[PDB]
Design a protein around this ligand. Structure first.
Ligand SMILES: CCCCCCCC/C=C/CCCCCCCC(=O)O[C@H](COC(=O)CCCCCCCCCCCCCCC)COP(=O)([O-])O[C@@H]1[C@H](O)[C@H](O)[C@@H](O)[C@H](O)[C@H]1O
Ligand SMILES: CCCCCCCCCCCCCCCC(=O)OC[C@H](COP(=O)([O-])OCC[N+](C)(C)C)OC(=O)CCCCCCCCCCCCCCC
Ligand SMILES: CCCCCCCCCCCO[C@@H]1O[C@H](CO)[C@@H](O[C@H]2O[C@H](CO)[C@@H](O)[C@H](O)[C@H]2O)[C@H](O)[C@H]1O
Lengths: 62, 431, 55
């Protein structure tokens, strides 16, 4: 077979009527994953950092 | 520097130049490999070869005429060169081969001898011309299932299954009057040629128009022709470029001049004012590279091609090259642009004004077929000098920044990383 | 989706915007969850028990 005859990708290729269709979806997903991760990391860090603050039993009002 | 073009029944285009010594005459049709099908692919190249066949060529040699033909994507041309005095005898041979002998050239003994020659011709190309082979496959994948994907020389399988009838069918559908332009370059006058043409009447298939098709489109993709037996790796990479008659036609060509071409063995080449050279010369990432801005009727390709024996560092070659291209959107300098302008003029000049009329014919013909006229060399320079850093940035931010690419390569390309890795380098991280 | 191309225009969302949105999310999300949680458990909470007490 001739290498110049590219195999069929029709089943995978999107009928390009909206050029930035896959891009907008991918970037939204990537962006949302980045958002929820950053909030998660912040919460995780604060959880550990706050474990070092004065314990409930040592806040005695003399 | 005169661009004269008038229309009677046929459109005549000429560009006279006093001192020339010779004159070239020929017809250029507005159809090429981009008009063929995957199955009759190579018919145009086949036509070119019989037009230059020993028989037809000997008839012109006796008369003291030289033949030349060129098969491209958007067009096709048949040229006859002669002395300034025999400017009329070239037209006799032109008409005699496109009306009288448009049945004598297609003999069963001539066709088979020619077919056998283009087969060994196209085979030799695929077997040894790796850089052009790669560039051809680049068009193939970049424009797959679209007109620009078909290779100019045609494929071996479509060629060997081609018959005399296919030639005729193509000739009767594209070698029409409304899809043609008679070009004359050398020293002969416009009025000198148009008279000899308007002298002999006869329309021959007038009013007939060529068949239509579907618009060309760029598809980010790749074709990897790995071959570990080859001593090097040849790669070509590009983004969707600019079509001819595009506002950014020149901005694109200037952008390619910024990175230019290189040859590691030429002392002077290693000294060019190209920032990319600081990166690639340390470990000698390649033997050579060259950027280009290919333009066609419906689309184009902007990118580069390269050859290398440093098979374990191909990723650095691609990485440094793409980082430089990133600069066009964010930090290209005034002096880089200015250096490009000067060098673009020098190269554009050396092309448009060579001491060979056959090149002039192809350049003139191809232009008038698309825009109905030719932009003067002096007009180009005005457009080139008018380009600012802001223009290049706006162009790059639209054509290069975070845009799909097309890749093709052959030889020892194990080190050429996956698509996504290359594609990710079309941009940079930022706050 | 053209809704994306209005705010970010074919480009990915940048870290700064991601970080900024994260601080906003944290506050909003917490209130939304606490509200639903306390409402779902109406009657069982100490807030509710204290209302039924007077001393
Ligand atoms: C080391 C790696 C650990 C990974 C463990 C993974 C297993 C899942 C359980 C995680 C439990 C910890 C988080 C938690 O309980 O917070 C909970 C939220 O947890 C998440 O969102 C977890 C998902 C994050 C996954 C990791 C993201 C990336 C990794 C970062 C590494 C760097 C509740 O959060 P918070 O807002 O109440 O805040 C907190 C909470 O209210 C505190 O009580 C308060 O003191 C503080 O001020 C406040 O900010
Ligand atoms: C342990 C638990 C940890 C949980 C935290 C999860 C990490 C959050 C994932 C969000 C990904 C954010 C993002 O977009 O990262 C991009 C970088 C870029 O990597 P790149 O190769 O340079 O880019 C190619 C793709 N672009 C950026 C062009 C789109 O890609 C990366 O560097 C991502 C690698 C992250 C590894 C962690
Ligand atoms: C481990 C603790 C977790 C910390 C948080 C996780 C990391 C969040 C990273 C968030 C955003 O990081 C961001 O990524 C996008 C790509 O996705 C980058 O975008 C870059 O690549 C994209 C994609 O080719 C281009 O469109 C864009 O023009 C370019 O700038 C952006 O400049 C960077 O700022």
């Amino acid at each position: 077979k001739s290498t110049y005859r590219t195999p069929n990708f029709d089943d995978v290729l999107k009928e390009n009527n909206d050029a930035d269709k896959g891009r907008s979806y991918a970037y939204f997903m990537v962006g949302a994953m980045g958002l929820l991760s950053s909030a998660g990391a912040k919460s995780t860090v604060e959880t550990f950092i706050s474990s070092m603050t004065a314990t409930a039993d040592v806040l005695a009002m003399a | 520097a005169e661009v004269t073009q008038l229309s009677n029944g046929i459109v005549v285009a000429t560009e006279h130049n006093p001192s020339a010594h010779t004159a070239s005459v020929g017809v250029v049709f507005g159809s090429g490999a981009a008009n063929e099908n995957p199955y009759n692919n190579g018919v145009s190249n086949l036509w070119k070869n019989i037009f230059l066949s020993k028989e037809n060529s000997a008839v012109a040699a006796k008369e003291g005429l030289a033949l030349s033909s060129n098969i491209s994507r958007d067009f096709q041309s048949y040229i006859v060169s002669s002395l300034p005095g025999s400017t009329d005898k070239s037209l006799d041979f032109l008409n005699q081969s496109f009306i009288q002998q448009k049945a004598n050239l297609l003999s069963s003994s001539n066709f088979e001898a020619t077919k056998k020659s283009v087969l060994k011709q196209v085979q030799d190309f695929e077997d040894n011309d790796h850089p052009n082979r790669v560039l051809e496959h680049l068009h193939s994948t970049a424009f797959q299932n679209t007109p620009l994907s078909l290779p100019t020389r045609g494929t071996l399988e479509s060629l060997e299954n081609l018959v005399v009838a296919d030639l005729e069918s193509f000739a009767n559908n594209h070698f029409l009057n409304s899809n043609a332009v008679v070009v004359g370059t050398g020293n002969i006058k416009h009025e000198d040629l148009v008279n000899s043409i308007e002298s002999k009447n006869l329309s021959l298939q007038t009013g007939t128009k060529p068949v239509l098709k579907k618009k060309a489109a760029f598809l980010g993709s790749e074709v990897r022709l790995r071959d570990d037996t080859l001593p090097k790796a040849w790669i070509s990479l590009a983004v969707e470029g600019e079509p001819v008659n595009s506002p950014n036609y020149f901005v694109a060509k200037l952008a390619a001049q910024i990175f230019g071409s290189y040859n590691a063995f030429e002392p002077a080449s290693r000294l060019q004012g190209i920032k990319l050279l600081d990166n690639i010369q340390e470990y000698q990432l390649c033997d050579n590279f060259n950027h280009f801005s290919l333009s066609y009727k419906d689309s184009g390709l902007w990118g580069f091609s390269t050859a290398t024996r440093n098979v374990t560092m191909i990723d650095d070659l691609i990485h440094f090259t793409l980082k430089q291209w990133n600069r066009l959107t964010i930090s290209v300098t005034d002096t880089e642009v200015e250096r490009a302008k000067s060098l673009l003029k020098l190269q554009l000049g050396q092309l448009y004004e060579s001491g060979n009329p056959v090149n002039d014919a192809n350049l003139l013909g191809a232009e008038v077929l698309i825009k109905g006229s030719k932009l003067s060399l002096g007009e180009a320079f005005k457009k080139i000098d008018a380009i600012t850093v802001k223009d290049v940035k706006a162009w790059a931010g639209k054509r290069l920044w975070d845009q799909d690419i097309a890749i093709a390569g052959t030889g020892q390309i194990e080190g050429l990383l996956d698509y996504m890795r290359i594609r990710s380098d079309m941009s940079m991280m930022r706050w | 989706s053209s809704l994306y191309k209005t705010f970010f225009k074919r480009n990915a969302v940048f870290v700064g915007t991601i970080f900024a949105g994260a601080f906003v999310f944290q506050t909003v999300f917490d209130t939304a969850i606490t509200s639903w949680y306390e409402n779902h458990n109406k009657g069982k909470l100490w807030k509710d028990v204290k209302a039924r007490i007077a001393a």
